[PDB]
Nucleic acid binder design. Structure first.
Ligand SMILES: CC[C@]1(COP(=O)(O)OP(=O)(O)OP(=O)(O)O)O[C@@H](n2cc(C)c(=O)[nH]c2=O)C[C@@H]1O
Ligand SMILES: [Mg+2]
Ligand SMILES: [Mg+2]
Length: 539
DNA sequence: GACCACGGCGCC
DNA sequence: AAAAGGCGCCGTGGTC
C-alpha cells in the first residue's frame, strides 16, 4: 500500500497494538489506518486517537474501550471478527480468521490496518445472500459491540475493604480445616494437590475409588465423588469444606480487590463477543459472569458488588427463559400452557425433590431444582440423576420419563433438529445464527451422541442469547436518556446502575423493553429487583 | 518469567 | 464420575 501521512480519510480501517490484551489496562503502542490503497501510520498513537470518528476494523470494540478510557467518544463500527463469527462461530481469534480469509495477524499496526481492510472485503463477499446473517450483523452484533464498549469502560463498584477483612477471616477457617485434614491423614501434605490427595484417600486410607478422570484415567477426587464418600470417613467432609473456602478465596476474595482501576476506582471486565459456539457472550479478566451466589460465603462475596453513592443497582433476570424458548421452537401445547397459566417448573421440581409444599420451596431449593430441570432436558443420564438426588436408579429413571411425556412435542423437535443438522452440517437459532456440528454422523456412538447433545442445545441456548443481545441493543439508548448505566450481562440477566431518584422508573422501563424484545408463542417474564448491592437487588 | 494440559469448580 | 449444554480461572505439575 502507498504510504500516506496521518490522518486517514473518513471510513478508513484501523490497526492498533496494545501492550496487553485488556483494553482498560493496556498501553496503546501503535495506531494506523488503511483505505483507498493507502496506509497512514500515526506518529504518536494517543494523540492520533482524536482524529478518528469511528473504530472500524479487527477488535474494534477493544480500541473503543481504550478510547472511552481516555475520555474520547470513539464508537466501534464494522469488525471482520463479527462477520467471521456469524459465518462460523468457531471463528474466535484474529489469528485464525486472518489465516482463513486472506492474511496474517502480525504485531504491527499498519499491517493490522491493511489486513482489516482486506478481510472485511472478503468476508462481506461471503455474507452476500446470507440475509439472516446480515440481519444479525446489522441489527444485533455491530450495534451490540458499541453497547459492550460502554459497559466495559464503565465498570462496577466493589467494596474492597469489605473483601480484605473477609480474607483474613476465611484464612483462619481454612487453617482449621486443613489442620483437621492433616491430623486425619496422619501427616501433612499439599491439600491443594489432587494428585497427593488421591494417594491419601484411596491408597493410605483405602477408600473406594468411585470414578476416573477423563484424560489421564486417575482416580477422581471430584466433589461428586467425595459426596458419595461422605460417610466413609470424617476427613471427606473436611475436604469438601476446605475446597469451598479455598475456591472462593483464591478465585474471588483475593484477586478482585487488586483489580480496581486507578483512574476509575472501579472493577472492569471484558465482554467477549466472538467467544462461544452458541452465540452467548463470555466475560473475562476478570470473569464477572460467575460471581458466587449459591452458598452463604458466596452470597457474602456477591454483596461486595455495590452501587455508587447516590445510585442503586437494578437487576433484571428472564424467568425460566430457555424453557420458554423451547416452547416456541418445539410448539409443545402443554409447555406453552404452563407459561400461560403462570406455572413455575423450577418450583414444581423443587417441592417434589425436597418433598415440601411449593410455598415451602426456599431459594436454595429452587436453584437445586434448576440444575435438575436443565440437566434432564439436555440429556442427563438416569444414573447420574439418581446419584445427585440420593434416590434409587429406578426412581431417577421414572422422573426422566415423566419429564418428557409431560411435554410430548419436545422429543419430536429434538429429533427433527438433529435430522436437519445431519443434512446441512449445521443447526440454527430462531434468528438463523448457525453452529456447524460435523460429528452428527460420526461412527463412534459416544462421539456422535455428544455431538447430538451439543447440536440440539445450540438452537435453544443460542436463541435465548439472541433475545438478550437484541434487548441490550434496544435498551441501551433508553438508559442513556435517563442518565442510567448498563453494567453487566450474565446470559439472561442485566445489572444496571441508576440514580436513586430514577431507579424505579429505570427498573420498570428495562423490564418492559426486555419482556417485549421479540414476542414469542409464550410471554417472556422478567424478575427485577433494586438494591445497594448485587445480592440485595435480586433478593 | 512464560507456555500448556489437567482436574476441578464457580456461574448461567 | 456418570449421555446435561455453554463458559473462564484456579493450583498443580511439567516444560522451556
Ligand atoms: C441463559 C438461560 C439460563 C438462565 O439461567 P437462570 O436465570 O438461572 O434460570 P432460569 O432463567 O431458567 O429460571 P429463573 O430463576 O426464573 O431465571 O441458563 C441456563 N442454565 C442454568 C442453570 C442454572 C443450569 O444449571 N443449566 C443451564 O443450562 C438455562 C436458563 O434458562
Ligand atoms: Mg433467569
Ligand atoms: Mg439468570
Amino acid at each position: 500500500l502507498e504510504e500516506a501521512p496521518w490522518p486517514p480519510p473518513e471510513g478508513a480501517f484501523v490497526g492498533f497494538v496494545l501492550s496487553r490484551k485488556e483494553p482498560m489496562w493496556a498501553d496503546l503502542l501503535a495506531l494506523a489506518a488503511a483505505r483507498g490503497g493507502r496506509v497512514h501510520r500515526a506518529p504518536e498513537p494517543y494523540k492520533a486517537l482524536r482524529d478518528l470518528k469511528e473504530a472500524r476494523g479487527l477488535l474494534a470494540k477493544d480500541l473503543s474501550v481504550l478510547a472511552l478510557r481516555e475520555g474520547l467518544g470513539l464508537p466501534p463500527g464494522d469488525d471482520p471478527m463479527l462477520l467471521a463469527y456469524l459465518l462460523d462461530p468457531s471463528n474466535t481469534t484474529p489469528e485464525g480468521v486472518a489465516r482463513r480469509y486472506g492474511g496474517e495477524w502480525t504485531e504491527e499496526a499498519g499491517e493490522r490496518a491493511a489486513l482489516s481492510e482486506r478481510l472485511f472485503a472478503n468476508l462481506w463477499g461471503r455474507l452476500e445472500g446470507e440475509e439472516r446473517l446480515l440481519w444479525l450483523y446489522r441489527e444485533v452484533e455491530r450495534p451490540l459491540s458499541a453497547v459492550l464498549a460502554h459497559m466495559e469502560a464503565t465498570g462496577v463498584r466493589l467494596d474492597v475493604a469489605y473483601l480484605r477483612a473477609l480474607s483474613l477471616e476465611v484464612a483462619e477457617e481454612i487453617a482449621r480445616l486443613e489442620a483437621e485434614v492433616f491430623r486425619l491423614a496422619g501427616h501433612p501434605f499439599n491439600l491443594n494437590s489432587r494428585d497427593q490427595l488421591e494417594r491419601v484417600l484411596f491408597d493410605e486410607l483405602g477408600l473406594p475409588a468411585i470414578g476416573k478422570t477423563e484424560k489421564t484415567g486417575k482416580r477422581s477426587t471430584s466433589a461428586a465423588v467425595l459426596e458419595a464418600l461422605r460417610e466413609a470417613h470424617p476427613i471427606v467432609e473436611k475436604i469438601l469444606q476446605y475446597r469451598e473456602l479455598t475456591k472462593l478465596k483464591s478465585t474471588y476474595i483475593d484477586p478482585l480487590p487488586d483489580l480496581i482501576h486507578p483512574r476509575t476506582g472501579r472493577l472492569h471486565t471484558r465482554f467477549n463477543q466472538t467467544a462461544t459456539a452458541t452465540g452467548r457472550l463470555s466475560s473475562s479478566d476478570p470473569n464477572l459472569q460467575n460471581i458466587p451466589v449459591r452458598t452463604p460465603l458466596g452470597q457474602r462475596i456477591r454483596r461486595a458488588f455495590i452501587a455508587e453513592e447516590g445510585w442503586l443497582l437494578v437487576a433484571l433476570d428472564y424467568s425460566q427463559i430457555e424453557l420458554r424458548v423451547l416452547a416456541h421452537l418445539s410448539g409443545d401445547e402443554n409447555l406453552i400452557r404452563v407459561f400461560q397459566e403462570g406455572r413455575d417448573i423450577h418450583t414444581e421440581t423443587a417441592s417434589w425433590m425436597f418433598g415440601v409444599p411449593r410455598e415451602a420451596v426456599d431459594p436454595l431449593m429452587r436453584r437445586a431444582a434448576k440444575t435438575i430441570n436443565f440437566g434432564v432436558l439436555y440429556g442427563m443420564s438416569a444414573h447420574r440423576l439418581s446419584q445427585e438426588l440420593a434416590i434409587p436408579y429406578e426412581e431417577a429413571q421414572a422422573f426422566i420419563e415423566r419429564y418428557f411425556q409431560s411435554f410430548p412435542k419436545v422429543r419430536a423437535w429434538i429429533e427433527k433438529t438433529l435430522e436437519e443438522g445431519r443434512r446441512r452440517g449445521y443447526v440454527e437459532t430462531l434468528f438463523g445464527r448457525r453452529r456447524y456440528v460435523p460429528d452428527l454422523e460420526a461412527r463412534v456412538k459416544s462421539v456422535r451422541e455428544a455431538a447430538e447433545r451439543m447440536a440440539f442445545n445450540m438452537p435453544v441456548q443460542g436463541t435465548a442469547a439472541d433475545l438478550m443481545k437484541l434487548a441490550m441493543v434496544k435498551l441501551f439508548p433508553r438508559l442513556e436518556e435517563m442518565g442510567a448505566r448498563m453494567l453487566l450481562q450474565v446470559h439472561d440477566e442485566l445489572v444496571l446502575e441508576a440514580p436513586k431518584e430514577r431507579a424505579e422508573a429505570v427498573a420498570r422501563l428495562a423490564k418492559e423493553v426486555m419482556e417485549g424484545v421479540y414476542p414469542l408463542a409464550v410471554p417472556l417474564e422478567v424478575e427485577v429487583g433494586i438494591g445497594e448491592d448485587w445480592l440485595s437487588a435480586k433478593e
